[PDB]
Every structure is written in C-alpha cells, then in structure tokens.
Amino acid sequence: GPSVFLFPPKPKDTLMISRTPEVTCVVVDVSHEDPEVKFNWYVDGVEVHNAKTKPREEQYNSTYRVVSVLTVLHQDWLNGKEYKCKVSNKALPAPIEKTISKAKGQPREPQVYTLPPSRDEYLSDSVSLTCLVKGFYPSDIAVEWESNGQPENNYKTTPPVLDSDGSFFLYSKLTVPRHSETMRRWAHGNVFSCSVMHEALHNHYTQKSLSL
Amino acid sequence: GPSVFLFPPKPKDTLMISRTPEVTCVVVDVSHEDPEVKFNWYVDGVEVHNAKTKPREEQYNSTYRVVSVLTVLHQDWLNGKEYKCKVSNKALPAPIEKTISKAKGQPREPQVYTLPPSRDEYLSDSVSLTCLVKGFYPSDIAVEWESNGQPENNYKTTPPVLDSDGSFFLYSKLTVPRHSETMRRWAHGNVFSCSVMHEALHNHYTQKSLSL
Ligand SMILES: *[C@@H]1O[C@H](CO[C@@H]2O[C@@H](C)[C@@H](O)[C@@H](O)[C@@H]2O)[C@@H](O[C@@H]2O[C@H](CO)[C@@H](O[C@@H]3O[C@H](CO[C@H]4O[C@H](CO)[C@@H](O)[C@H](O)[C@@H]4O[C@@H]4O[C@H](CO)[C@@H](O)[C@H](O)[C@H]4NC(C)=O)[C@@H](O)[C@H](O[C@H]4O[C@H](CO)[C@@H](O)[C@H](O)[C@@H]4O[C@@H]4O[C@H](CO)[C@@H](O)[C@H](O)[C@H]4NC(C)=O)[C@@H]3O)[C@H](O)[C@H]2NC(C)=O)[C@H](O)[C@H]1NC(C)=O
Numbered sequence A, B: 001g002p003s004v005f006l007f008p009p010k011p012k013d014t015l016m017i018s019r020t021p022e023v024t025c026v027v028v029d030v031s032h033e034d035p036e037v038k039f040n041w042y043v044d045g046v047e048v049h050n051a052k053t054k055p056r057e058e059q060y061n062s063t064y065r066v067v068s069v070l071t072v073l074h075q076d077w078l079n080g081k082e083y084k085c086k087v088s089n090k091a092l093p094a095p096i097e098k099t100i101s102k103a104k105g106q107p108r109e110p111q112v113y114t115l116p117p118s119r120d121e122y123l124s125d126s127v128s129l130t131c132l133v134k135g136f137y138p139s140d141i142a143v144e145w146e147s148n149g150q151p152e153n154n155y156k157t158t159p160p161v162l163d164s165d166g167s168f169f170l171y172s173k174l175t176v177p178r179h180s181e182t183m184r185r186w187a188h189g190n191v192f193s194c195s196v197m198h199e200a201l202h203n204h205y206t207q208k209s210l211s212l
C-alpha cells in the first residue's frame, strides 16, 4: 500500500524573505492497478488550493512516486501554522493524513562563542576553530564559516543536542590543515567568522569573529 | 506481521572486561492471535546456546514486545565477529534474520583537547567547559567528566559526526552555572577532566585536564 512522507522547509528558507520556503508531500509505492492520487492541503485545518503537484513518476521497482509542493509564507511558518497533506488513492482503506509545523515552544536566542585551538593541537596535522552555539529554541538553525568575506568550506557541524534546560546547543568545527593557505591566514592573525541564522536573532543573523 | 530490530553493545561495555557487553534482538508488532516467538542465535554462523529470552511487555497499542539478550565476549566483538538473530512466528511468511557486527576498518586513536569558556560567556547564566574529541574510528566511544576523582554529571555530549577524512569527532560540554559550588571550584582553579574510552587508546582510556 502507498506511504506518505511530509518534509518541512529548510531552516535558511524561512528566515530570509528572499528565499522560498516549501513543505513537500511525497507519496511512494503507488501501484499500477490504482495509479490515481489526489492531494488535499490544509493550513491550520483550512483547505488551501495553491500547491503545485507534479505528474507521477514511475520508479525502477515498477511503483509510482508522486510529489506535491506547497509554498509557505515565512511568517506563517514562524507563527506556528500547521500544514496538513491528505493523500487519497483507491488502493487505500482510507486517506492518509500527515501534518508538520515548527516545534512548539517559546523561541530562545542562541548565544554564540568562538574558541581557538588548544595549544596542544598545533602538534597534529591540523587545528580546529570551534563555534559553540547554545541556548536556542526551536532546533532549526543554520551555521556557516567565512574569512575575509568569503566562505570557508572545510567545516562540519554537529546536530543540535537537547540540553538539560530544554534548549538546544551544537558545535561547529572549521578545520585548518597544517599546510594550507587557511593555516597561513590563521597564523597571520586573519579573522575567521562563525555565522548563525535563527529566528530568535535580530535580523535572524549574527556573526562572531575569531583570530589568533 | 511483526518486525525485528537488532542492537550492538554499549561502547563502554566492550572496553572493560569487568563489564558485560550484550547484543539485543527486539521484536515489535507481535499480536495476541499469534503470540509465540522463537529465537536462534549464531556467531559467525555458529549456533550458540547461551542466549536468554526476557518475558514480554504488552504495549499501549495492544501489541506485544519480545526480546532476547545475548552476552558477548569483549574480544569477539572487537575482532569483528558477526552476530545473527533469527525470529520465528506463525504470522510471518518466513523467519526474519538480522545480523550485526562492529564497523570495519583500522581503528584510529582519539585526540582529546579541552577548551575553556570564552571570556564572553562569563556574562551569561553559565559557562561551558568544552572537550573536543577528534580523529577516532570506529565511532563507538564513551565520554565522561570528573573533578577531584568524583564524577561531574551536568554534561551533554554530541553524537559522533563523520569528518571529511572518514574519522569521527564529537564535542562534550560540561555546564558550570553562574552561581554554584562547581563555579566556585572553577573560579578557584580546581582541575576538571574529560575522560574518553575508545578501543584505540592504550588501556582503552585517556583523560585530559582543564583548569582556570
Ligand atoms: C520503490 O522505489 C522508491 C525509490 O525511488 C528510487 O527508485 C528505486 C527503484 C531505487 O533506485 C531507490 O534507490 C530510488 O531512491 C522507494 O521510495 C522510498 O521509500 C522509502 C520508504 O520505503 C522512503 O524512505 C523515507 O525516507 C525519508 C527521507 O527521505 C529523504 O531523504 C532520502 C535520502 O535519505 C531521499 O532519497 C528522499 O528523496 C527524501 O526526500 C528529500 O530529502 C531531501 C534531503 O536529502 C530534502 O532536502 C528534500 O526536501 C526531500 N525531497 C523533497 C522532494 O522534498 C525518511 O525521512 C523516512 O524515515 C521516516 O520514516 C521511517 C518509516 O518509513 C521511520 O523509520 C523513520 O524513523 C522516519 O520516521 C520518523 O518517525 C516519524 C514517522 O514515522 C516522524 O514523526 C519523524 O519525524 C520521522 N523522522 C525522524 C528523524 O524521527 C523514510 O526512510 C524514501 O524516501 C523513498 N524514496 C524516494 C526517492 O522517495 C520505494 O520504497 C520503493 N518501493 C519498494 C517496494 O521497493
């Protein structure tokens, strides 16, 4: 029988009015015997009519996949509106409903702290620039690095982790290899910046800088 | 029909011979109508007869949960042996098999670095003692904090994260509230320690100290 998966917008997309946040309802395991799929969409229980539904796509396992995309208004998402996708198909005993929304709770502002490498780390093949981001809610967030106005690509960021007070934290690590131009910038006292995007920040953005 | 899930031992359990590492086979969605479940266990395909089955727990959705627990030898697990669980039941077309073993590849030693709070963090409601653990493989690891040989429990540790070189890293964060005896110890210069257990460390253990 078919199955439905409902995906939220990307965190960057709801925070910048220039971007296009979307909720996406995906139906898989749609059969040949009953290939017709109907979508209904609701926002806080009220039906909306502006989703864009793609034609069905046959998969190599001889089932169909069908996708419907609803554009959301940035402030609706951030105001906690609920998005429901209802999927109808003759092979179902009844329609499948799925709902998604921003996690419930009072938003909380991230605190951002940059930490330089341990002195001991200079003996290894690289050093780590650390960005601690704590105290935030909900867990939807974006974290990036840059230096001299240009993005730094060699970084990895932990998932958010639930803290003992109900907020989240994470850490982001920018690697600076022993022999690299990035290492020479760090050595020269060049400034690196940890950038954070979150609904509870002013202008949804803050940067914290780090240098030797 | 029911479903089967198979779980590895806790990382700490395989690294100390005094502890009892276990592989656990969990059966979900077992009905009243066909309630009987059988287990067979195999190690590198060889039937072993020393597993023990727990009595079952009925779930709030009117299904049952059933489990079998097998004790393993620390060195069997660390040497990559394969553990197979076979589940039999009248409601299934054929028995279900699931297999598990330690991640494959050359173990790599964690490198451990303690980082003190950002000067900026002293303005907030707490400070964070940070432990960066990088360069380790496989991702199985345990991390704890202590001070004066006594455990410190107000900490959270991120999951392991895959780094760009195929090793893992994580961070562990020990919270030190603005007003607390633990803050008074940190202020006074007491040493706090990040303890790490991993198969590739000498004696499976290392500690790194941090003080003001
Ligand atoms: C027939 O084939 C298709 C595959 O299509 C293609 O063709 C075949 C022939 C092969 O070549 C395939 O390799 C090929 O892909 C099969 O369709 C698949 O069906 C499975 C289910 O059987 C679906 O699994 C779900 O996957 C989602 C994650 O999906 C995103 O990421 C995938 C990569 O990991 C990606 O492939 C998908 O397209 C997908 O969508 C995109 O994701 C990107 C990020 O990569 C995102 O940016 C995009 O926005 C998004 N796309 C769009 C258009 O927006 C996963 O989330 C699901 O897990 C949930 O459900 C599980 C139960 O099924 C559950 O165990 C999980 O824990 C999780 O559920 C959690 O708990 C509840 C819900 O239970 C919920 O509250 C929680 O929030 C939830 N999550 C957590 C964290 O707790 C699930 O694994 C595949 O997506 C789907 N593939 C495609 C392409 O649609 C089909 O199965 C085949 N049929 C047969 C019979 O063989």
Ligand SMILES: *[C@@H]1O[C@H](CO)[C@@H](O[C@@H]2O[C@H](CO)[C@@H](O[C@@H]3O[C@H](CO[C@H]4O[C@H](CO)[C@@H](O)[C@H](O)[C@@H]4O[C@@H]4O[C@H](CO)[C@@H](O)[C@H](O)[C@H]4NC(C)=O)[C@@H](O)[C@H](O[C@H]4O[C@H](CO)[C@@H](O)[C@H](O)[C@@H]4O)[C@@H]3O)[C@H](O)[C@H]2NC(C)=O)[C@H](O)[C@H]1NC(C)=O
Residues within 6 Å of the ligand: B003, B005, B007, B024, B025, B026, B027, B028, B029, B059, B060, B061, B063, B065, B067
């Ligand atoms: C009636 O209610 C029941 C309970 O609410 C339902 O049972 C649940 O059914 C779902 C889906 O059928 C199972 O989901 C799987 O969980 C696996 C992980 O389970 C571990 O972690 C969960 C989450 O915390 C925990 O509840 C489990 O008990 C289990 O770990 C135990 O606890 C700790 C935590 O890790 C662990 O250290 C212990 O070792 C272990 N306990 C013991 C005794 O050893 C996932 O790995 C599964 O992933 C599969 O499917 C994915 C599909 O996306 C895929 O990505 C994966 O590769 C993999 O194939 C899967 O998500 C729940 O485990 C199960 N709950 C319990 C308690 O068993 C029941 O379904 C419901 N009935 C109906 C009809 O709905």
